[PDB]
Amino acid sequence: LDPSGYNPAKNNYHPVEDACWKPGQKVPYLAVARTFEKIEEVSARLRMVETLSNLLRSVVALSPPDLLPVLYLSLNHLGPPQQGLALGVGDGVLLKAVAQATGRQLESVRAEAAEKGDVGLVAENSRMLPPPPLTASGVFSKFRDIARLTGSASTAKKIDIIKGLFVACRHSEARFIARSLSGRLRLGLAEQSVLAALSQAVSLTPPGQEFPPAMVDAGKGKTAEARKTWLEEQGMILKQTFCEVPDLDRIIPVLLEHGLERLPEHCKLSPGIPLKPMLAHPTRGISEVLKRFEEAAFTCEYKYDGQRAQIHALEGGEVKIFSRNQADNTGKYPDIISRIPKIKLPSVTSFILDTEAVAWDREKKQIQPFQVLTTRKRKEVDASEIQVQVCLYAFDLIYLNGESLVREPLSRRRQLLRENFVETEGEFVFATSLDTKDIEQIAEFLEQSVKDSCEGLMVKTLDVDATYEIAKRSHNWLKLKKDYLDGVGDTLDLVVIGAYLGRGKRAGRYGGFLLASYDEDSEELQAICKLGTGFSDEELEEHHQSLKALVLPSPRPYVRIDGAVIPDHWLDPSAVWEVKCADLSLSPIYPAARGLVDSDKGISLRFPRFIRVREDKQPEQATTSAQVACLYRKQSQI
DNA sequence: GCTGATGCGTG
DNA sequence: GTCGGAC
DNA sequence: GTCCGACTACGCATCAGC
DSSP states (O other), rough: OOGGGGOOTTOOOOTTTTTTSTTTTBHHOOOOOOOHHHHHTOOHHHHHHHHHHHHHHHHHOOOSTTTTHHHHHHHHHOOOOGOOOOOOOOOOHHHHHHHHTTOOHHHHHHHHHHHOOOOOHHHHOOOOOOEEEBHHHHHHHHEEEEHHSSSHHHHHHHHHHHHHHHHOTTTTHHHHHHOOOOOOHOOOOHHEEEEHHHHHHHHSOTTOOOOOOSSSTTTTSSSSHHHHHHHHHHHHHHHHHHHHOHHHHHHHHHHHHHHTTHHHHHHHOOSSOOOOOOEEEEEEEEEEEEHHSSSOOEEEOOOOEEEEEEEEEEESSSEEEEEEOBBBGGGHHHHHHSOOTTOOOOOOOOOEEEEEEEETTTTEEEEEEEHHHHHSSSSSSSSTTSSSSSOOOOOOEEEEEEGGGGGSSSHHHHHHTTTTBBOOOTTTTOOOOOOOOOHHHHHHHHHHHHTTSSEEEEEEETTTTTTTTTTTOOOOOOEEEGGSSOSSOOOOOOOEEEEOOOGGGTSSSSSEEEOOOOOOTTTTTEEEEEEEOOOHHHHHHHHHHTTTTEEEESOOOOOETTTSSSOOOOOOOOOOEEEEOSEEEEEEEEEETTTSSSSOEOOOSSEEEEEEEEEOOOGGSSSHHHHHHHHHSSOOOO
16 A cells, blocks of 8 residues: 555564555565665664565565565665676766756756755755656666666666656655665665675565465564574575675575575585675784784785786686676686686696786886786777786685685695696796794785785685685785884875865765875975875864865965866865875876976875874975975885 | 766776 | 774 | 775776767
């Protein structure tokens, strides 16, 4: 009945009864829209998971086929990552498409969306013959349609579909379609919560029951200590099957048929399906390394400054390569799929490798900085056109000749790789390693890593919790790098010359800042980076306040920002701020120290973060562009 | 055909 | 990528 | 400690306007 009252938060929820659509029907969008409201209006993850599980339990019950689209809509994805589907819609399009469904001038709506920090708000509030209600599988279909449109005049074909949806919207549905398209759904619930909410709902209301189903609450006969243990157990089955097959188009099918408990029997890590890779927790010292890893024996590997390349060789010759995000990078490495046989021993018949592809200068036999690695062509590439040579630095092995080494320790996997593959210096090399426990030979290896052009030390255990089982701990490796050590690495004192407006969590004060570095010769300040991270909320207000005085109507004439985003508020140069950063880069758009190191290009910071306010310094006292040039030169340049 | 704006995926 | 915050 | 969402530089790919 009236979907505008659907409350899946309501206590003692019943899949069939407090639904707001009768069985075998399509699930309505305002179902999802209402649910989303019930989620964004709480803050306890555990409560938010329940509200989704509910909507999910119903869907499992009355409308099985709609399930998969609901998860996706709730994840705000479009499909499996390897499909590389993308909306190609941006704020420009969407804002426009909004104005076009409502009337206001783009330049009026445009300011409301910046003043509110949320597009979805503006679409709804703006106020003919009403069309049929929207369905959830319907909106998912239109979203995919928009993704698929390409080539000239495709934006315009997109703005229609969008104008379409917005015009079949009822109550809140505007709010959430806008937000989905803008990439920023911001509910407070994401993958993990969606995953946990699914595993619950199919445990409370198991799938494949003939309607009307026997057990809508398979939980009702448990004790609270028993339920909370039961769900959590079922949770991990789902979680780890996903971490090996992070693809809902494969799972949700089998789930619906064989239920949760036997899902690991049909959904197994197989070469060709890309799995989630092992993340790295930051470790700000070496004290901290032995606090975390007090007992266990660990290895030490260089941290290469390439990108992650997940290499699949499947029984059947064919190679596929995937990125950190399960994106299909096969097209962009024809110089890898070729060199492929030259690393697998001949008795190696199917494998999965966890490596980092780094840029290699052949004519010099030395590394090339990340910036160069990124100048390779993407998408599809023919093998002749290649220009930036890449050399892999393999540091794990996850599958070999049939077996799935997830369950084996690192020490098991290391020898298994070391002994099955072949080093080629300039193509294929094991991460330079040094097993130890020795503080003095660690920092001797730390400084060494960098000396050899790397960000620092990877640090992982060898036997104790040494698996590749992402589901237990996902940041179980440790990343140890120079700029984390309070009192090391490059910190500069810089000038706040403008500020940017916030989005979402920072809606209603400044979300970013523009930072500048006194050039001496030109008696000009010069934009060097933006900065939107590393302050607390309390500091970030002290900011938006003590800067609410300095506000300018126009630039000062001695400030030169060039091709940086024009700040939304310009500022009278007073505040001086100390910034830490992991590197300095040759900026294709920043003015600071342009000329001193390159004909055209300035210099920016890599991973800028704010450390503290430098009151005792005055703007002519901050770091000079002559200074800035110096740090870039003293930075493993060869 | 080009160019500027900008989406999106690496980090 | 870095980072804080709420639970 | 986990999970989520603020924010960042760099560059290839793409398409509206011209």
